[model samples]
Target: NPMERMDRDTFYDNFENEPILSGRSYTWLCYEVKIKRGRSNLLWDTGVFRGQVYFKPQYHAEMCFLSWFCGNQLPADKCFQITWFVSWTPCPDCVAKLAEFLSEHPNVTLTISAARLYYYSERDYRRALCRLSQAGARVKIMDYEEFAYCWENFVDNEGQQFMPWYKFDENYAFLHRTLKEILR
Candidate 1:
C-alpha cells in the first residue's frame, strides 16, 4: 500500500512541465499526433487482448479526418484537436491516456474538464475528475450548440441510465488552451 503514497515532487514536476491540452495548446500538427498515437495504441493493445473492447467510431473518425485534410500526414499530436469533429465513444481510458500524453509533451496542453464531460460518467467519472483537480488540470464541460443537444439526447436515453447523469452547466466552462501565441 505504501506504493500508493503520494510523491509531491513527481506529481508537481509532471504538472509544472506539461501544458495541458486545450484550445490554446492546439498547434498545427503536434497535438493531433499525440492524441492519435495514444488512442491507436490503446485500441491496438485492446484488440490483441481478444477484442474485449475498443473505440471503433473514434478511430474511424480520426482516420477519415486525416484523409480529408492532411492525407497520409495525420498529426498524431493534434489528434485531440479535430476529435470533436468526429464520432466516437469517450471513456476514462481515452482521457487518461490523452492526459498522460499531455504530460509528456510540454508543448501540448490538456483540457481535463472537456474530456471529463464528453468521455466519462458515474464513479469513474468522479474519480477521473478528482485526479484532474489534484493535478490542477484545467477543467470544463464541453459545450456546443449542435453537440450539446446531441449529448443531452444521448445522455437522456434509457441506455445511458447506467452512467451518472450530469446536467451540462454552461457557466462552469473552464478547460481552455491554445497552440501558440498569435503570429508576429
Candidate 2:
C-alpha cells in the first residue's frame, strides 16, 4: 500500500480515545503520515501516505515502511527527515530492525512519535526505546501539538476542530515524564 488512510469515523473514534482504549487489537494500528526530505544545498522532496497499521515482528508496520522505502530506491544523496506517528511504539526486535536500517542509511533520520507504549510496565520495552534512541531514532510520545497536527493533516474533519479527550493532558503528562526519564 503506497499510503494507508484511516476512515473519518475511525480517526474520530480511535484518535479521540487515549492510549488505553483499543485493546481488542494486538497489532496496534500505527497511523503515520507525511515525509519531507532535503538536499544538501539545493533541493527538496516531499511525500504523503494515507494510513497506518500497528506493529508486528517480521511483517510489522515499521519493517513494511523500511523495506518499502529501501525496495523502491529513493535517492540517498542527501538527508531525509521523516517525522511519523504510530499508535504503539515499536517492540524490541523491530527496534533492532530499525536500528540496523538507520545504521545502513545514515542519510535518513526517522523521528517516531508514538501515541502509546507497547508494554509500559516491562523493563524491556522501555529499554528498547532507549536503544532505539541510541541507534539514532528520535523517539517521543505524542502530545497536544502532534495530535492536532495529525488531525489537521490526515483526518477529514470537514470544519470540525480538533478536540482533546478529557484525560488527554493527564496522560500526556504521565507519559512525557516517563519518556523523559527513560531517555535520560
Candidate 3:
C-alpha cells in the first residue's frame, strides 16, 4: 500500500532547481517527522545542498536533523524520526555521523530507504549499510510500495492519484532483486 503513494516526479522536482544534481546520478532526500501514537507526523523535509567536493555543505540528513533539533521549541516529551530516501546509499562517513547522532538522541530513530547503493564496487560503501544496521538504524531499499507512500503522503500531486510508468512493475522488480542481492 505504501508503494501505491509514491510520486516520483513530485519528489524529484524538489531538487530541480539545484543544478549540481542535474546530470549527476546521486542525490538524497530526508524527511524528518515526529511520532505521535506510533505513527508519523512530519515536521519538515529537506534535500542535500552541496557546492563542490572541497567545500562540503549540509547533507539532507544533517540539515533535517539540525533543523528539527534547533529550529523548534517542542516539549521535552516529543520524539522524532528521520526517513531518508536516497538515490545512493550514504557513504561511510555520513553513516558514521548518523550513527553518532542516534547514539546521542535516544528518543530519535532513523530509517534509510535508498533507491540504489552508491559506490557499489567499493567495500566501504557496503560496510556503511552494515554499520547502520549494527547501530540499530533501519536500512532498506525503497520499493514500489514505499514510493507510493511517498507520493500519497509527501508529494503534491494536484489532487490526482499516481499512475505507474510503462515499466513500473519491471522497474520495481529490478530494484527489489538488486537490493536483496546487495544486502544478502
Candidate 4:
C-alpha cells in the first residue's frame, strides 16, 4: 500500500511553508511554530538548498539547540552528549546550586525553566532573594538576550567554519519586546 500523506490544505494548516532566506543580505525571514503535532520536527534537506522546508527537531532550550547542531556535524557518529536532568524547577536550593554551578563553569550555557527564567530575569535582585546555603561555585545564567549575543558573536567571530547556517537573531520587529525578543 502507498504511504498515506497529508493533503495541501491539511499540511499547510498544520505546518507553515518555510521562507527562503538568502543570508543576512537578504530580506527578513520570520516564522512561527504552529500548534500541530510533528510540525516542530522539520528539517532542511540537501540539494534543495535555496528554499526548502527541512525537518529538524524542535528545541525548547539552548542546550537542545547546541545538541541539534552537534548531531548535524557528526551525524554518522554518536557525537552529541545530552544530560537529562530528572526534574528542573525553580526551587530555592536548586536555583542557588544552579547559579553556583553556572558560576564555576563559565563556558557552559545553562538552560533554565520558565519559572527559573523568572527567577533569574530581574526577579533575583528585585524580588526576595532565595537562600543559597548549599550553593556551589556557580556557572553562568544566560537569559534570552545574553544567549543571543553570545551565539551571534560566536558566529560573527568564527565565520562559516564555526557558524551554523540558521540562527536565532536576538533583535527583530516583534511586537512583544520582553518575550520572544530573540527572533530567529
RMSD of each: 17.1, 3.8, 6.5, 16.5
Q: Rate residue 176 of model 1 by lDDT.
A: 24
After TM-score superposition, the amount by which residue 181's alpha carbon in candidate 4 deviates from its true location, in angstroms, is 16
Model 1 spans > 4 angstroms off: 1-89, 112-116, 119-121, 132-137, 142-184
- Name the regions of candidate 3 deviating beyond 4 angstroms: 1-32, 36-77
Give per-candidate clash totals: 32, 7, 13, 17
Per-residue CA lDDT of model 1 for 55-127, tens digit only, reads 4523432223323434443354443322221121234554455455446655433432232223344566456
Using all chains and alpha carbons, the TM-scores for the candidates as numbered come to 0.30, 0.78, 0.65, 0.21
Model 1 sits at a Cα RMSD from the real structure of 17.1
Candidate 2 global TM-score:
0.78
lDDT preference between candidates 1 and 4, better one: 1
Off by over 4 Å in 4: 1-89, 115-184
Question: What is the C-alpha lDDT profile of model 3 across 150-174, one tens digit per residue?
Answer: 5666566668775645555665566
Give one digit per residue, the lDDT tens place, for model 2 in 77-150.
Answer: 65667666666677678888888888888887878887766665476745888888998989988878888877
When summed lDDT is taken over every stretch of 10 residues in candidate 1, the lowest stretch is: 43-52
lDDT of 3: 0.55
Our model 4 lands, by Cα RMSD against the true structure, at: 16.5
**In model 2, which residue pairs have backbone atoms overlapping below 3 Å?**
4-50, 4-51, 5-50, 5-51, 28-54, 29-54, 30-53
Model 4 vs. true fold: TM: 0.21
**Candidate 1, after superposition: displacement of residue 168 in Å?**
9.4
lDDT per residue as tens, model 4, 32-140: 1111223343222111001111222121222232333335533332212222111112333334444564455443333321111222345443221232212322122
